[PDB]
Paper text:
Our laboratory has previously reported the crystal structure and biochemical characterisation of a glycoside hydrolase family 1 ([name]) β-glucosidase highly expressed by [name] (ThBgl) under biomass degradation conditions. β-glucosidase (EC 3.2.1.21) catalyses the hydrolysis of β-glucosidic linkages in aryl-, amino-, or alkyl-β-D-glucosides and di- or oligosaccharides at the nonreducing ends, releasing β-D-glucose monomers. This class of enzymes has a critical role within the set of enzymes that compose the enzymatic cocktails designed for plant biomass hydrolysis, thereby alleviating the inhibition of other cellulases by cellobiose during the reaction. ThBgl is easily inhibited by glucose. The molecular basis of glucose tolerance in β-glucosidases is not completely known; however, it has been correlated with structural features at the entrance channel to the active site rather than the active site itself.
As expected, the mutations did not affect the overall tertiary structure, thereby preserving the conserved [name] (α/β)8-TIM barrel fold. The ThBgl-Mut and ThBgl-WT structures are very similar and display a r.m.s.d. value of 0.28 Å over 464 Cα atoms, with each monomer being considered. At the other extremities of these residues, the conserved W338 (corresponding to the residues W349 in HiBgl and W339 in TrBgl) delineates the new, narrowed entrance to the active site. In the presence of 0.1–0.25M glucose, although ThBgl-WT showed an accelerated decline in activity, ThBgl-Mut reached its highest levels, which represented an approximately 300% increase over the value measured under the no glucose conditions.
Residue numbers in the entry: 0 to 464
The structure:
Amino acid sequence: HMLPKDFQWGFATAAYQIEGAIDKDGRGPSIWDTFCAIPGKIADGTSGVTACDSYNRTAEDIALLKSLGAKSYRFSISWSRIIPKGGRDDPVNQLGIDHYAQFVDDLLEAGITPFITLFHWDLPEELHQRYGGLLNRTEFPLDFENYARVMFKALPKVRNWITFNEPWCSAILGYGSGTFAPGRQSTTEPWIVGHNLLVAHGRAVKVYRDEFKDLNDGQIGIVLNGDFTYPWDSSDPLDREAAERRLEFFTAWYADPIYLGDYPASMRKQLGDRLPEFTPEEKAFVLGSNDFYGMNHYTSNYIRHRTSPATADDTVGNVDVLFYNKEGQCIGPETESSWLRPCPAGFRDFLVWISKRYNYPKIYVTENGTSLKGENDLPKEKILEDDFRVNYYNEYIRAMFTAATLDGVNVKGYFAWSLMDNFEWADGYVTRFGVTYVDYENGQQRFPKKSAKSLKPLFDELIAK
């Protein structure tokens, strides 16, 4: 009835979502700086120029992280602050490096373990323009590999590294539906982008293990999102299979090559030649390139097989992703995110799914949290109340606990998304995911919500001292 004492817990952000200061200390433009410039791409017509101004408030956030009793903190490095043009032949920005080097020292001094994300969607614009960015099988993995190397040298004190955050998003949403940067819409390119992300990952991991890992006994891994699935009609085997295939398209897409050494068989049979093949060199990079499994999880769905054959523009694996099953049952209540409905049981099920499929690897839950329906349109100290979010964390974390203590899922860490309300990409600022209310009307004042303080006693209970 107790998690291990070295179980890390805390909060998670991303650079472009909280930092602001986009034109500070020589930061180059990312693809998201340009994406937000396009009218209609962002719902509230906003961007991350100010965000939470966390670039300027490192002492304030660190103090907040302490206030809530965080043992760890997951954040991302803005690539274009380190190398403004991104490439392995481009000038390196020391002021960018120093800003993060000082941030790590400030965390270490305040016993908060940094979990660092190398790439959180903010690819330097120059790389996109120079050779096609993520789409380029030859150039991008080499540039990422170098950028990883640079950060490994720059931050010797950091022992917890993440390569890519949610490559599924960068590929499907960035190149399929075009809802995320760079906003391309293709039936072929997402599957090419996904492949490149994998190779870049493998390249960075090898460099880390060979030159930096044994320096301080660290670990590196990729972060994969994925919502669990249940048959829309469990009496129909086509729905049972659909629900499984849907996980394969979402998650095993990246994880099967990293652990098994090849793409899921189900993906190869639908996509065919559109799905790339690993060269020996590429496979040698990708296979076994996880020290730990980085996991993002938010919700679950009912999956209904489709009667028609898979279209060219399909990305979910020829299925219907629903919130009601055939009997009229509902996944969970309505949130501010039409795609997110609470389902704590699905959290534990995904944990066990991963464990069974990949021989029970070390798992870090790098993201977990919820939005709240109509949260942005209600009074201040009523935002500080967030019983809905409190309940979300209570049940989800306890579901994770069961997964660890009963099933024996090797989860060593949990990070709540997010430390505070921030730029929710295409949703803008309308959608709040934070446990801390950020006051944008009044200079991003930090006001912790009821859920923020609820995480300390919850984890106090579940961890063993």
